[PDB]
Structure formats: C-alpha cells, structure tokens
Design a protein around this ligand. Structure first.
Ligand code: HEM
Length: 154
C-alpha cells in the first residue's frame, strides 16, 4: 500500500502527542494488550509471571520494554513508508528469536489504536484513526513479507 502525505500527516501529528510521554503510553498499551489477549504475555520470559494489572503497572522492566518498543515504532513511522532498513533487524529477531506471529502484531495494533483513542480523542478522530490503521497495516504487511523471506510463518 501507499499512504498519501496527508495520511502520514495525521499519523505523525498524534504520534508527536504520544512522544510527550513515551513511557506512560508504552505502559498503557502493553497492559491493554496483556489484559485483552493474555496469551501474548507468555512470550515475555521476563514478565510472564505478572498476575495483575497492578503488578504490571509496577514493573520497571515492563515499562522499559514499552519505551524500547514504542521508540522503534516511532522511528519506523517517521520514515513514512521508507523503512526497509529499520524493518530488517526487527523482522529477524521477531521471527527467529522471539517467534511473534502476525496475529499478535495485529493484537498490539488494536491496543495502540485503543489507547490513542482514549488519550487523544481530539487528535484521533475518524480520519486520523483510519490513517494510523493504514500505517500499521503497512507495517504488518511489510513485516509479514520479511518473515516469509526469513523462513517463518506465512
Ligand atoms: C508495534 C510492534 C512492535 C515493535 C515495534 C516491537 C519492538 C521491539 C524491539 C525494538 C525490541 C528489542 C530488540 C529486539 O529484540 O528486536 C523487542 C523485543 C521483544 N519484543 Fe517486540 N515489538 C513489537 C510487537 C511485539 C509483540 C506483539 C510481542 C509479543 C506478543 C513482541 C515480543 C517481544 C519480545 C519477547 C521481545 C524481547 C523482550 C525482552 O527480552 O527484553 N513484540 N520488540
């Protein structure tokens, strides 16, 4: 696919709001993913044992990870579709070290869209949500093609 510049604008405008507090958004998003789809928590050997949302909130490791993951996602979105390089090392570790199915990336995309909608309703109207979804669909589609070249899934 290909986003127009206007769509990229809508995506990078609400992302700039996220960047005002990356660690808070990363906690909200990972907790929303683990509460909605608890099977995803099992992929993390580091926090797998967390039993409640309070324990998740208080975990520093979980918060660090959230920052690591959002930061990488932000660096990809800022590329505006020219992210080949960035995607490479990311697709490799997720396909052969962590083993993250495409379905899980869909789950976190849904968690990202849920939190942005809750926190930033003014900058996340229907058109901006359609654009963000488009950008994540692109990210998934390109990672899915990379997984296949690498020998994993699809
Ligand atoms: C927006 C999508 C995502 C981004 C941008 C992302 C980004 C990252 C980055 C940059 C790292 C550290 C370097 C590396 O290992 O490659 C990481 C590690 C990891 N990610 Fe992902 N990730 C995403 C989605 C997921 C999902 C959906 C899962 C699990 C259901 C997953 C599981 C993990 C695991 C298990 C590690 C290792 C954690 C630890 O050992 O520190 N990732 N991810």
């Amino acid at each position: 696919m290909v986003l127009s510049e206007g769509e990229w604008q809508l995506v990078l405008h609400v992302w700039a709001k996220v960047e005002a507090d990356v660690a808070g958004h990363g906690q909200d998003i990972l907790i929303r993913l683990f509460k909605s789809h608890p099977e995803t928590l099992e992929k993390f050997d580091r926090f797998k044992h967390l039993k409640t949302e309070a324990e998740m909130k208080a975990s520093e490791d979980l918060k660090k990870h959230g920052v690591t993951a959002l930061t990488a996602l932000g660096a990809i979105l800022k590329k505006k579709g020219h992210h080949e390089a960035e995607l490479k090392p990311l697709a490799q570790s997720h396909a052969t070290k962590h083993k993250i199915p495409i379905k899980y990336l869909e789950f976190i995309s849904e968690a990202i869209i849920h939190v942005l909608h809750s926190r930033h309703p003014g900058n996340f109207g229907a058109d901006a949500q359609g654009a963000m979804n488009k950008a994540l669909e692109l990210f998934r589609k390109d990672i899915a093609a990379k997984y296949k070249e690498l020998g994993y899934q699809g």
